[PDB]
Design a protein around this ligand. Structure first.
Ligand code: ATP
Ligand code: ADP
Ligand code: MG
Lengths: 539, 523
């Protein structure tokens, strides 16, 4: 019928069974624990023993405790009521609003959608970031990748992409938090209640998003399957409902790391540099479930933390085959102070072809690639020469190229809480010819930084007008200034007579609810009969 | 040869019993002739098979869990990290020389608990709750769960409180928060202990001003620091008075591994109490790489599989829940905070080091301290172009916040033109002036070790290089001109800006006049 935990090694525990062993990728439950604990079996030991992975911390499992079989894979409650809910890996409410108002639980482990039901019709997903929609154009229902180091600006692109595409769609979306910080988790909960994507009250059914959160605090059972828990509710809305759902998964690398933290612990030799031996079927099984079929559409948005901007590690080097549109973030362009710091060379999508979009889109983005590759091949030699002997034919594809690295920049709506400048929702054909102009020489007349953090071709000519005036401004130093006391300025002590009286009490309020109990001077132990005794005094 | 053949072996098919009648008669005199050589059968207790170096392998113990404190028969405390099939691997707190093959192991049943509370303010324990400061046991304290998971998503709010460090190299250049996880990653002997201790002495001399609801108490976790350095910092905390509002858990390098492994964990167990009861808490997890080496010692004796640099698999999860339990709660649980300082020493410049890539991805902001910048006069040797934060505005002083954009972006161009000094150009009054500006900005932003200067003096001190008042002053003597800018101005204007908090035009008129009223000794 049921079995017992026989062995605990950190975050993997071993359950023995007396006949009819559970199928692989089923769910187990322990009774008498603090929280409900789900064990997901990964391999059979051989001696009537499954080997598990732990959805929460194992600190507390006694050897021999009762383990029941649910006989079935992990079931999350899918449904239309799940919108506006912050969801766990194992189906829990962690936003503390009752149970999940949904039915028809579904197995979150399945096979990939087959080869026959594959979509090849491609639609350009216009986002609103001038480096995305020109250079690496995303695909509707396709895949969106995001690499970059820790501190280059990956996650602030993701919520910016939510404000771009997940608001102006009307349907449903899903934010799949896989092992990121709670800070960028909790802040996104506030900036979707205020932006009205997630609602509270009796309007829970008109919302647009579910949040599946497997953040960094959980042990790697939960950080390894929150990718699948966020995935299957997106694949539930695809096949049953037909709506296009946007999957915003964060830190796909943390999905592959959470596998790799216990993959050695299940009895496997480490692979290349120390990552997991089975990363191919782990990630390849993850990715090809995220597609768009004949029945519906899933537009995957993937953020990946890469360690120290090195793309030779095999845990992101399997991901490059698995992403059509890739927005590779360079720390160098952020060290230039340019946001978004999207690489003009490393970030290249699959929509970029004149056989689909049109020659007017493909030629300027290729024209961007000529002027920016040669700018990289010349900024090595500009430090030996200083750009003074080039005979005025290589001083044209440089001066525009120093402008075009600023013309990838844009103030963000989600970032204006800490940058001050208001964000732009930029369209496509207005800036393609705008990108085309500064490549051609129509805007050679302008200075350097008028291109920085702007939008259309109207705002670049109007940053120079303000900039040109500001070189005519601050041309005075004499008198009639703020520094005199004649106009409105009080004396220095009459500021001080409006200060509010701040009380200091020196005892700080620390003995009001703290139950200042006593602790034992001698360590308390148990006896063989189990009752509490002090230590029997003998070595 | 299967288990059904084993269950068929449970059915007796002997067909004769011409031994069992007699071997049952000579069994009991045999076991009672050799009765002295029998240790008793032990079920809910434990007894040691193998012991060595901090990992002791104990037979039996059917009652223990993972993470239950056990007590050996000499009084030594222990911890059950993994539980194998027939035995339980027990990690040993302290020196392990007293344990033999055959000694008793007593289960205490509880999860490991180190005493928490405000009565510990002024005491130095190790990672186990035992006092080393020579002031006896801890009074008005209580035990708490050190293995607790972090506060959830519904429990937190957006951070607002800036957490002034008292350092102009920090508060203007890297915005810190009160619930922000700030990493101090550098080389060895480069000022990492300098930046952390500058924050606490500032937070003590700004603790006797703030009214009960921004009072940031500090716990400084010493992992693997030698015991003279522990007496050094206790001498530093006492001789300014900071020990009144300072707890310090101090795991030396001459202690065992798991006392160093638990000391940041017990270090945050104190500071969760300051978060739970509405106050603000400072935590510094000093030498957090050396705590991870203290993790690597236990596993590689524990027959556990190694990975990158022979560190185990789950070492990301170690530093994750060590730095996720520091937070800023919502209004519904007091509104308390915790702000985090992990210290990671690079292996002389490996940012792709295995511990580094974990802790740079967990934490919110990082502060690079190269050994390059430490000898160019820049002390503390903060790297500006490589240091990022998260929350930006509403994480600095708000009057500083407007002038910080004038400070950061001019520093951004200056780091690009500083390496272009191989030709002697100084062309068109801009390739010299941004060299003339940012060099004085570097000569602005140096300071002294153990000199906590409040932000209200720094919002004036940041104004001296952003405006004029320094456009005729050399690159040699700004470090003795800044103090005369501090001294000769009216000492009442610093209080009213910290009273205001923002650069109003009502106060902007005074701040342009008073810096020409001062006369600079750089000449
Ligand atoms: N801001 C500073 N100004 C002047 N000297 C400094 C400064 N910071 C550090 N030092 C020098 O560096 C030495 C070590 O300081 P500190 O312990 O802060 O560095 P650390 O990198 O934390 O050292 P460790 O790596 O050993 O912990 C001190 O002896 C001091 O002489
Ligand atoms: N367009 C932008 N405007 C303002 N700040 C930005 C922009 N792009 C990136 N940043 C900065 O980059 C930093 C890192 O952001 P984040 O996505 O958290 O990085 P990571 O994904 O590496 O953790 C943020 O603090 C943010 O202020
Ligand atoms: Mg030090």
């Amino acid at each position: 019928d049921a079995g017992y935990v026989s062995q605990v090694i950190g975050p993997v525990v071993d359950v023995r069974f007396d006949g009819e062993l559970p199928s692989i990728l089923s769910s187990l439950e322990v009774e008498g624990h603090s929280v409900r604990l789900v064990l997901e079996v990964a391999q059979h030991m051989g001696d009537n023993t499954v080997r598990c992975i732990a959805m929460d911390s194992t600190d507390g499992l006694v050897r021999g405790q009762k383990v029941v079989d649910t006989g079935s894979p992990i079931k999350v409650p899918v449904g239309r009521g799940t919108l506006g809910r912050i969801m766990n890996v194992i189906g829990e409410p962690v936003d503390e609003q009752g149970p999940i108002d949904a039915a028809d639980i579904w197995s979150i482990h399945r096979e990939a959608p087959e080869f026959t039901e594959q979509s090849t019709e491609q639609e350009i997903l216009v986002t609103g970031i001038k480096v995305v929609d020109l250079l690496a154009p995303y695909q509707r229902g396709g895949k969106i990748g995001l690499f970059g180091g820790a501190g280059v600006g990956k996650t602030v692109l993701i919520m910016e992409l939510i404000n771009n595409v997940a608001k102006a769609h009307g349907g449903f979306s899903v934010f799949a938090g896989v092992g990121e910080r709670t800070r960028e988790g909790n802040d996104l909960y506030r900036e979707m209640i205020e932006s009205g994507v997630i609602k509270l009250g009796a309007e829970r059914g008109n919302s647009k998003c579910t949040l599946v959160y497997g953040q960094m605090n959980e042990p790697p059972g939960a950080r390894a399957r929150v990718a699948l828990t966020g995935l299957t509710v997106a694949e539930y809305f695809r096949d049953i409902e037909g709506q296009d759902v946007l999957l915003f998964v964060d830190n796909i690398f943390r999905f592959t790391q959470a596998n790799s933290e216990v993959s050695a612990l299940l009895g496997r030799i480490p692979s290349a540099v120390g990552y997991q031996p089975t990363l191919a079927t782990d990630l390849g099984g993850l990715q090809e479930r995220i597609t768009t079929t004949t029945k519906g559409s899933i537009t995957s948005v993937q953020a990946v933390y890469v360690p120290a901007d090195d793309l030779t590690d095999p845990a992101p080097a399997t991901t490059f085959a698995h992403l059509d549109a890739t927005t590779v973030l360079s720390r160098s362009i952020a060290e230039l102070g340019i946001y978004p710091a999207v690489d003009p060379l490393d970030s290249t999508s699959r929509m970029l072809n004149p056989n689909v979009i049109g020659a007017e889109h493909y030629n300027v983005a290729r024209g961007v690639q000529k002027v920016l590759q040669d700018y990289k091949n010349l900024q090595d030699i500009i430090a030996i020469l200083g750009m003074d002997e080039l005979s005025e034919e290589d001083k044209l594809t440089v001066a525009r190229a120093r402008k075009i690295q600023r013309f990838l920049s844009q103030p963000f709506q989600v970032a204006e809480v800490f940058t001050g400048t208001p964000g732009k929702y930029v369209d496509l054909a207005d800036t393609i010819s705008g990108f085309q102009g500064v490549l051609t020489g129509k805007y050679d007349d302008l200075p350097e930084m008028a291109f920085y953090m702007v939008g259309d071709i109207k705002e670049v000519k109007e940053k120079a007008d303000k900039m040109a005036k500001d070189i005519a401004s601050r041309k005075e130093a004499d008198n009639k200034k703020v520094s005199e006391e004649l106009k409105d300025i009080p004396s220095l002590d009459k500021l001080v007579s409006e200060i509010k009286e701040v009380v200091i009490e020196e005892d700080d309020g620390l003995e009001e609810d703290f139950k200042a109990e006593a602790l034992s001077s001698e360590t308390v132990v148990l006896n063989e009969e189990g009752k509490s005794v002090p230590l029997p005094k003998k070595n | 040869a299967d288990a059904k053949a084993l269950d068929e072996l449970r059915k007796p098919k002997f067909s004769s019993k011409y031994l069992i009648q007699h071997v049952s008669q000579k069994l009991i005199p045999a076991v009672k002739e050799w009765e002295k050589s029998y240790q008793p059968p032990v079920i809910h207790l434990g007894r040691v098979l193998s012991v060595g170096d901090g990992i002791a392998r104990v037979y039996g113990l059917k009652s223990v869990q993972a993470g239950e404190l056990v007590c050996f028969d000499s009084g030594v405390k222990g911890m059950a990290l993994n539980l194998q099939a027939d035995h339980v691997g027990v990690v040993v707190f302290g020196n392990d020389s007293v344990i033999h093959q055959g000694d008793l192991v007593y289960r205490t049943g509880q999860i490991v608990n180190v005493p928490i509370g405000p009565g510990t303010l002024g005491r130095v324990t190790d990672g186990l709750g035992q006092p080393i400061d020579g002031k006896g046991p801890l009074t008005n304290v209580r035990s708490s769960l050190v293995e607790v998971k972090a506060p959830g998503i519904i429990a937190r709010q957006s951070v607002r409180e800036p957490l002034f460090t008292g350092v102009k190299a920090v508060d203007a250049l890297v915005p810190i928060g009160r619930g922000q996880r700030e990493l101090i990653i550098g080389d060895r002997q480069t000022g990492k202990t300098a930046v952390a201790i500058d924050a606490i002495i500032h937070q003590k001399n700004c603790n006797e001003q703030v009214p009960k609801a921004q009072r940031v108490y500090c716990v400084y976790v010493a992992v693997g620091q030698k015991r003279s350095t522990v007496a050094q910092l206790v001498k530093l905390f006492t001789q300014t008075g900071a020990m009144r509002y300072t707890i310090m858990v101090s795991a030396t390098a001459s202690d065992a591994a798991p006392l160093q492994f638990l000391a940041p964990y017990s270090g945050c167990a104190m500071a969760e109490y300051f978060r739970d009861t509405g106050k603000h808490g400072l935590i510094i997890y000093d030498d957090l790489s050396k705590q991870s080496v203290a993790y690597r010692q236990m596993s590689l004796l524990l027959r556990r599989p190694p990975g990158r640099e022979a560190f185990p698999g789950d070492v990301f999860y170690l530093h994750s829940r060590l730095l996720e339990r520091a937070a800023k709660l919502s209004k519904e649980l007091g509104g308390g905070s915790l702000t985090a300082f992990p210290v990671i020493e690079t292996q002389a410049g490996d940012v792709s080091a295995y511990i580094a890539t974990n802790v740079i991805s967990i934490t919110d902001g990082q502060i690079f301290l190269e050994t390059e910048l430490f000898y160019k006069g820049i002390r503390p040797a903060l790297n500006v172009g490589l240091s990022v934060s998260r929350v930006g505005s509403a994480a600095q002083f708000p009057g500083m916040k407007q002038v910080a954009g004038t400070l950061k972006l001019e520093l951004a161009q200056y780091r690009e033109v500083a390496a272009f000094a191989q030709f002697g150009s100084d062309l068109d009054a801009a390739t010299q002036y941004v060299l003339e500006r940012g060099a004085r900005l570097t000569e602005m932003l140096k300071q002294k070790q153990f000199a906590p200067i409040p932000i209200e003096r720094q919002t004036v001190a940041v104004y001296a290089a952003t405006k004029g008042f320094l456009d005729k002053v050399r690159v040699q003597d700004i470090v003795a001109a800044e103090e005369a800018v501090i001294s000769q101005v009216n000492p009442a204007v610093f209080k009213i800006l910290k009273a205001n908090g923002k650069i109003t035009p009502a106060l902007d008129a005074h701040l342009k006049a008073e810096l020409r009223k001062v006369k600079l000794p750089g000449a």
